[PDB]
Amino acid sequence: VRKDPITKEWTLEGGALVLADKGVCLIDEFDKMNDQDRTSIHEAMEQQSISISKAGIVTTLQARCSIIAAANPNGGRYNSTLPLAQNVSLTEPILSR
Amino acid sequence: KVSRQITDQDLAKIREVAAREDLYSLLARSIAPSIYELEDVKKGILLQLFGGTNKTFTKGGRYRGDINILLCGDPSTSKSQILQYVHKITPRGVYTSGKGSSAVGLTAYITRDVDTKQLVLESGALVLSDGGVCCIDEFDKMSDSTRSVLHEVMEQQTISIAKAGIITTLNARSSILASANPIGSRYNPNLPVTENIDLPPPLLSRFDLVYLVLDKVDEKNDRELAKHLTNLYLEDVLPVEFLTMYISYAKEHIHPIITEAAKTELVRAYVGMRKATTRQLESMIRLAEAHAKMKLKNVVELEDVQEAVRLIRSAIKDYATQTGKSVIQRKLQEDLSREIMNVLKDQASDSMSFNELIKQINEHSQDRVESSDIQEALSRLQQEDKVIVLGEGVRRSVRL
Amino acid sequence: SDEINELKEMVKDEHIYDKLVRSIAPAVFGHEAVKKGILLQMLGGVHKSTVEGIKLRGDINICVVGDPSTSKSQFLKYVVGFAPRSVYTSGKASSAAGLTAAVVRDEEGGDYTIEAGALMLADNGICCIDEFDKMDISDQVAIHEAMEQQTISIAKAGIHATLNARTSILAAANPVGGRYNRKLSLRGNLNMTAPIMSRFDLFFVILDDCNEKIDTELASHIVDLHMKRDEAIEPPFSAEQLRRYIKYARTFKPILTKEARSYLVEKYKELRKDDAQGFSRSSYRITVRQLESMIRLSEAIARANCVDEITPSFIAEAYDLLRQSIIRVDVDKYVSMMNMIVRKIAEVDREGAEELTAVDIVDWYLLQKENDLGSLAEYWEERRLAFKVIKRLV
Amino acid sequence: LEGGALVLADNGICCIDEFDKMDESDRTAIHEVMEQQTISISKAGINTTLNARTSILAAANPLYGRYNPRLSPLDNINLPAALLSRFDILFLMLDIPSRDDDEKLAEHVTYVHMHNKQPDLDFTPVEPSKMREYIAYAKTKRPVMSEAVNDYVVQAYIRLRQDSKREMDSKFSFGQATPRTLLGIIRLSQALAKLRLADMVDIDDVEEALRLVRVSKESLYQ
DNA sequence: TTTTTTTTTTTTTT
Structure with missing residues (x-):
């Protein structure tokens, strides 16, 4: 949510998901995602919406996006001869999602 | 009006000063009137303003005359005085400190014009130095973004700015001298030199020289220095502003050439230097062609590179006394991977506590180092994929 | 104009293949094969088709490595000092974005001003980095978007975007030991990930060492470079005529549809039959992409020889040419048993006798077996089988 | 354009805390x-270096919450x-409880609010005007060192230049008794002479600075 | 018949 030029209150910019409603959002390389922007991923697949933080306006949205996750294995080629839970860096809460 | 075209008759007064034998020493002692001894510094810095020559080829090239020089030693050497001096003599001077330097700091701040409300490209402290000499401390x-402009x-001998509205990659070419201190600030007796110079020897590979000041407690030094500072107080040949006009003439109007003669020496010495690198020899001409830009010689003397090589040896005589010792972290890693192996054999898990590891390291022998550097060697295994952390309380061993 | 009549004269010779080689960077001495790729980098690939669906590569890529003092950087200024639209920065500080967009906020006044940044005019060009x-590691794969998609979208929670990046990225890191690290599989040699690593093909290692003759030859030719004079030693090709030859060689769209690409299969097959073991070897795999790479080599080989449709010889060049720098990386119960029965000797009977006792071959094996097996049961058939095949071959 | 501090009052003392x-x-x-003798400014369109002839002094407040006696010098100090x-030269001010001096101290704190005027038994305060005129009478004097005292300034x-060095490792430190402490010691006798007038710079006129030399340091012990 | 306006709050960012 960004305040527009000169005198205007804050306009709300949709997360690209809003652009993707009824459609599908595509991601690759989860090793490269910060733990910051990744939080809200876990949101959409639960409510089918987004609820952010900034700032001055109570809202809700609608996110119908399907999600394609592509991510390279921890390190190189095949990682867990041990359980694949040993493979992913990402937390299981966002995984089983 | 204020708070230089060269006259003709003092030009042959320049050549008169050229037939004068000690101009190599003389002008140097005229460089830094304030400072006692350290003559190799006045020597070098003399050759610094005479530094190099332009090679433009057909294309590419542009190795210039540009010479960086580091100097350091016992803390506060009166290095900052020679910096604060030479800084002022220069057509374009530059000076700052350590920690007062960074990547973002010296190039193209590209600020708004403010009062006319228009963003206009600004030159950073490096663009203005283009030509002449920069100076810095320690x-x-x-910082880490420091050296990123370096x-x-x-x-590259250039700078790349594409950001905002306008795109220019514009050149910066100037010789430079940064003052410094050893980590001690005494670098301590004996010891390997590289770590003692701080920094890795790979980063030091580039810098054209290493100047090490030290403290002899000669008596006989500090009283001889005192007797230097004993003056002023109150109230030897030393030209003042005659050297400057000679700095103007001796640079463009001379176009020195190595001839054939250069190679027989400049080459053969480099084998024993090597027995050095192609970066030292890179300037083995540059420093000697700075002895070429001296004397008004358009064809340079075969015997200069003796004391040019000697100016290189000056850094090398500082090396007479870590990453430059060969194996090091690697021999430690043979015994690391062997300790991890023999634990993997003895212990039923691929993992062992880093603690049990260091108990198996630092104590057994003394080529077995301290915990954090064992952890830098296992970092060097980790960055090799040759270890696995398995929680921050223990250490796993690499697996199929 | 009339300078193609220069080019006909140049496209006659057999020898202009080796000529184009010794004619590229005089500022560099030796190093040979790596030179080729540089040219072959300026030279374009297919970078097109086959529908429907994604555009295949295309392009080519090189990260040249070796001990500092290598004088590899002399290649890089040669990129920018020769090639068209060359973007070059070595720095850590771009920053991040960088080749990525910032995105600049506040502009001010509504902001979201999208920086290029860095690689913009770099598009359709040879991009270069050092070290x-x-x-x-942060940006490692974020500049790798263009190394697969060939285009890079850029996200700060700015406005949704994607950017045309299509470019070769050539560079040179200094090895993390500063040297070889012979033993280092180039995978752990780099301190970087296979997705961005396997993608840049191929690296082409050069270690720079002293040798007494060579110390005098570096004291010969490197000296002649040190020389202001004689700098009069010349390449067989005038640089600018090499450039106009490229601007001519950039017109070609050479394609091997030729059925002798069947040979490229066997070759690529036998490309991975060797890397098959170890998987800690040159592998990689080597990557399915290295077949595409195998192709994108002869793409430029064709612009080199100016004829199209390529040949078995042409790809042979490139294949072996990979093969060095993949070799620069070099220094079902009983299927695990006949694996290591000939494998223990594979790593050891060349480097030693392959002797002593039968069960010692078991004991270093209880080391590496336990870590990739998936149970206590899969541990025991790594025990009693290392017993059972011993009394099988005893 | 307003330069503050180092510009504002020049050829005079700057007084700092924090x-x-x-x-x-x-x-x-x-x-x-x-x-000294400059402040450079490249900011905006103005490239001048304007004189800060300012004298420097600071009150150095060490990092929280107090300096620790076991700790090596410069540990307390967060400066470069x-x-x-x-x-x-610098004077370190330690506040160490003494059941003696803190008495007269607390009596000094309780001399407020009982009274207004603190001192007695006895001193008569010396007022700034008359004092400042001798202090400005002195800077004109301009002493010139005799060579005897000069050589003495060398020998000790x-x-x-030996005991700060022969103590080697920092511990107490700092060495080296660098040139600036000799520069200083000399300038301090140049300062001390105008307190004597003279211009002849007595041997003890040097020595009085010599007493302050180590007294500055070595307070790092208690 | 027209007049005249840059801090403070929050934000996303290396």
């Missing part, structure tokens, strides 16, 4:  |  | 002002190591 202490102009 | 150690 | 909280904004500039050889300074 390269051991420079890695940029040392060789 | 991957000094770009760290 | 000197470690000056950030780096003041730090590098004053880091120049120990080379290069900036403390730039001052001539050799063992001063």
